[PDB]
Design a protein around this ligand. Structure first.
Ligand SMILES: [Ca+2]
Ligand SMILES: [Ca+2]
Ligand SMILES: [Ca+2]
Ligand SMILES: [Ca+2]
Ligand SMILES: [Ca+2]
Ligand SMILES: [Ca+2]
Ligand SMILES: [Ca+2]
Ligand SMILES: [Ca+2]
Ligand SMILES: [Ca+2]
Ligand SMILES: [K+]
Lengths: 224, 224, 224
């Protein structure tokens, strides 16, 4: 069933619209390129001053707070990388609004006690809620939240892998059960209210996407 | 050995040519972004009215028929996703023709009888045969067919994986033997006449690509 | 810690700057798209006449020499593919200089003596040192060198994988130990002086990147 109620500018169009979608596509790719490399000036430049991001392991965070705890995680040996897997844009020219749709694999490297190294690879879709500064013409992201689609445990040596009990996996939504369970082993409190490939929060996510493209305020804060 | 007989517009060039290649690149990415999310209005918008697509499990299908059977598959629990892996364009400005070259991984999630979950990941290259509406200037894809390069079985828990006999794999071309064999277990009749990294259909595929860029009709229907 | 001393044009900007970053992004993607398909005219067109590239298995090579030994490798059954994973650009408009940052997975298919097939998948970042021809306006890459971030052994059938001793892996920098060790088994002499996610050559790589963007000659030749 098609989750979109309407169509937006997404292919072809005018040169101005093509270059707006190009600009928004670059913002999206800035998360994998800049966060993975700790290029924090570049990473901060993607966002509005009042931006909020959501992850499994942080929940909602204002961007500057997110950067602080990301640095802390990296200092403690946390090793999250991203593989971008296909990026397109929904553009609403008269609202100065856009949604960046960036398919990705979150690929996080863990150890389990020579210790067993493993990745958890989660195929997901980052949704960038972007707006255009009428003065500057510049695009910036105000919100980033993800759909989580499927995940897997990846042996690093091809022989050894960790073990997760059924009960350990059961509290997480299907789509990020291994990623949540592994991050929980590091001590993080995991957000269980993130959208997957089906269900209530999937519908909600598309509703907020269309609200944004219609020019409204959105409500991505789903615990209150 | 270089499979191209000639060079086309593929880097640099005029702003018009850069924006034409950008527009075609977006069409390509629409298959992973829109099909994986069941965004059917968006997916249909990529194609001409008379478009045909080829897959391992469907063979050649008119696009609207392809969408119908894709919906049916998804309703029956079929779970194909795509990871886009590098997209460039060959442009023929005076013919209003272009070829979109999109590297990808088809990543299909299966079960084998707690049941063993596994992916088959097939590295492939989608070829989008695109044309420009002289009135509108809009680019649309008339044909999509793939090169299949290599594949593998991916354990989801890192311990358990299915088993395929040599005979089960033997009828498929090298490049999609695991993908074909696994899809056949679902009941699909698999097209065995799809191009891989070498051989007769590889040459044929490049021949039809250059025919398209030269302005000709192409012959991608390889059973008659 | 942020490895960049300064900011460059990387998002938004003028249409001219957006189209310059687009053009450079295409050059980057030409390595995965054209080298994997042996499209040698296309691949050669990415580079300046005096270009040099660095890989694990070749060390530094002038591009035309690199193409010769790549053809030889492919004739001997070498099977390297690339998955592009996110590409952005740092642009210095007044210097006519740019750095292409292309995240990728090198995915090389090997056999070990029915023989065990396996991939080594190395997440890496290609750095393309690009310059703009003032006459033509065309962008070309003068240098390509990579950061190597992490790697893994990938079973092809989901059951069998090769074994590497600790001593076999120990001489390689963390980030490409499996890739280096496997390529060494083919007979290649492996460059051990390539940058990873931390340390002296990581800092050096960012230093040379900023030198390039400042208009200087760079020194990427790290053995003399
Ligand atoms: Ca604009
Ligand atoms: Ca609404
Ligand atoms: Ca709320
Ligand atoms: Ca155009
Ligand atoms: Ca011909
Ligand atoms: Ca025919
Ligand atoms: Ca230009
Ligand atoms: Ca300097
Ligand atoms: Ca030197
Ligand atoms: K990609």
């Amino acid at each position: 069933l098609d989750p979109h109620s309407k169509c937006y500018s997404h292919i072809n169009g005018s040169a101005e619209e093509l270059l707006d979608r190009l600009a928004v596509s670059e913002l999206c790719k800035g998360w994998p390129v800049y966060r993975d490399a700790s290029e924090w000036k570049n990473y901060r430049s993607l966002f509005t001053e009042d931006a909020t991001v959501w992850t499994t392991w942080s929940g909602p965070r204002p961007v500057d707070e997110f950067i602080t705890i990301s640095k802390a995680g990296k200092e403690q040996g946390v090793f999250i990388m991203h593989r971008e897997c296909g990026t397109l844009v929904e553009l609403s020219p008269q609202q100065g609004r856009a949604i960046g749709k960036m398919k990705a694999t979150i690929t996080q490297r863990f150890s389990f006690p020579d210790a067993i190294e493993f990745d958890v690879d989660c195929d997901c879709r980052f949704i960038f809620f972007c707006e255009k500064d009428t003065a500057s013409g510049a695009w910036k992201a105000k919100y980033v939240k993800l759909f989580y689609e499927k995940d897997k445990v990846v042996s690093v040596d091809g022989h050894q892998a960790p073990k997760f009990t059924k009960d350990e996996l059961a509290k997480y939504p299907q789509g990020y059960r291994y990623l949540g369970a592994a991050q929980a082993r590091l001590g993080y409190d995991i957000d269980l209210q993130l959208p997957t490939s089906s269900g209530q929060l999937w519908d909600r996510m598309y509703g907020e996407m269309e609200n944004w493209l219609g020019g409204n305020k959105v409500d991505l804060f789903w615990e209150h």
